[PDB]
Amino acid sequence: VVEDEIDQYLSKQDGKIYRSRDPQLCRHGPLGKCVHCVPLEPFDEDYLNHLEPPVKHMSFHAYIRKLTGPSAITLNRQKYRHVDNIMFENHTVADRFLDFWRKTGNQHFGYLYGRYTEHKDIPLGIRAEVAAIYEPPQIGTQNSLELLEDPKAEVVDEIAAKLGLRKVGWIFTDLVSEDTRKGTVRYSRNKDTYFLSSEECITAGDFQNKHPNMCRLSPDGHFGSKFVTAVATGGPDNQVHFEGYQVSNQCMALVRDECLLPCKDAPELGYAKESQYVPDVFYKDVDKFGNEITQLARPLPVEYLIIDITTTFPKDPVYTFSISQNPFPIENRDVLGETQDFHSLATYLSQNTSSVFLDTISDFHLLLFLVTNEVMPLQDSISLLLEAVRTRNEELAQTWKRSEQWATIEQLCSTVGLEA
Ligand SMILES: [Zn+2]
User: Fold this and answer.
1) Which residue numbers delimit the MPN domain?
2) Structural domains present in the chain
3) How remote is the CA of residue 34 from the centroid of ligand 1, in Å?
């Protein structure tokens, strides 16, 4: 069992925070060390709590480094994170997703496709970089999501893999218009209600189980997960905002063992099973007193299962894929009269005659269509082009353009247009 390349980068990296002397509060020669200059552990809560913004979960690698280099379950608020930040490459990746809710008024589901990189801001921290959002077959309503069967689910995964990408998590909307003059949205998820349902916590835990973090220090070989979960809801300003979560490892275990239950008409709480024997399950809560009040997890406020993860839009944006003024359409959107077929591609390619062909072709959703469409599936000769995209290799793109297979895509579009 072999860890991710980022977990192999991280384990071979010094996590400390070094300091030369400080001017006023150091009491020794230029060479000596003392409690005020000796380096800082990547798990020291003092350092983290006093950052801006104050961090309250150490990095996972900061945690196992902290560990000196049918009984009853008791849940504590978890002191470490698996992913430390979710960074959308750019606002366009996330706005085109919300486009589905703006058009239909139904909530919408996506899969975050991107990569795991270093998050240099936080000691040993991991960042999840979101580069595409795959929208699968699904039925949405005003007040509910439903996943449909995805025949292409793992052809998608195979294409993205040759793009440098993997599923880093999922996204859903919970968006409701507030003010229909101003164009605002309700601010429904806050301290006084909830940020993630018991419902959504169980499915979060399910996804995290189904997507385990490989780790050489576990007998299972699995431990934790890097599968983040992202919410699009109105914010305190009644504008759409994105919120990053994960669910505690303890909470993964409950869902794995089918012990976690939702509460009806109570999203902010969830049940724990009674009998299938169930070790009684507790949690070490926080009151007002400051007494470590232990309680029985029937009910359980979901907040003792949820892990905040910062969501960033970078000051300098990244473009794994290209921004068209009139982009190729996204999958599963015929509902809104916006379909992927050879008419679309024909007008897409005509619109981009004067463009760098690498930019024109560097679209995730286009690439899925090219490989999986049923008129002409380029399912086997796309490897060449997938690599031109992953690499921003313009010469490598220009040659594939001269392929037999691309020529016939092009005479297809040409006679589609010739029939118009
Ligand atoms: Zn000193």
Assistant:
1) 86-223
2) 80-312 (3.40.140.10), 334-418 (no CATH)
3) 4
